[PDB]
Point group: C2
């Protein structure tokens, strides 16, 4: 059987959330507390996403839908609150898997073009000749 956690081990859980989460007993105690006050949805969602990262790839589509059904869908039994930006991204990912793969890259490239490609075009002889016409 497991040995009683030492004083130092228990104290170390109060040094930061990562400390508590990496210790399996610390993590158990953190969750048990939150359940006792009906406030565990956030940690349970975090743990469900951690589990998602380890699953075999062919399982991902069904597991993604399970997490959405449990935590984020309409009427979800463990509903969590997100900021609008992160909610929006998530819904698009769940409902349109793969479609938004390049979303952050595309926003980066759009911003660059506004500062480089497009201003060069407006300055070009090609554009001036179309103005004339």
């Amino acid at each position: 059987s497991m040995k009683e956690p030492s004083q130092q081990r228990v104290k170390r859980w109060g040094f930061g959330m990562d400390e508590a989460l990496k210790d399996p007993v610390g993590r158990e105690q953190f969750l048990k507390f939150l359940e006792s006050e009906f406030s565990s949805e956030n940690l349970r969602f975090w743990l469900a996403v951690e589990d998602l990262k380890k699953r075999p790839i062919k399982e991902v589509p069904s597991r993604v839908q399970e997490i959405w059904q449990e935590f984020l869908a309409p009427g979800a039994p463990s509903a969590i609150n997100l900021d609008s930006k992160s909610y929006d991204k998530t819904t698009h990912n769940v409902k349109e898997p793969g479609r938004y793969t390049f979303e952050d890259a595309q926003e980066h490239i759009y911003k660059l073009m506004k500062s480089d490609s497009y201003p060069r075009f407006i300055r070009s002889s090609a554009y001036q000749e179309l103005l004339q016409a």
Copy 2:
């Protein structure tokens, strides 16, 4: 046959990149210009991602892979430059479709637990009782 773009139309492309892009003759001219100076990869990538967002969903995985191959894979013929953050997110999405569906939400929730769930656990009787006894 098409008529020559009026002076008013050509002028309009100068009120913002969005104006140039939504006019299909403006888009054509912008691209033609960038190709003449060998700097069109950024717009070509942008246009490929716009196209992706219109494709049927069953076609999205193969199309995602085709965009990765043309602009982003090793030795891509139309290689683009991204910032590290964008490139990391993109690679994960391409190589592990679906797995990072909840990335931004999980980060939101992780940071929230640092300010809410975690402190509540440490100040609880449950934790403080352990420490004492």
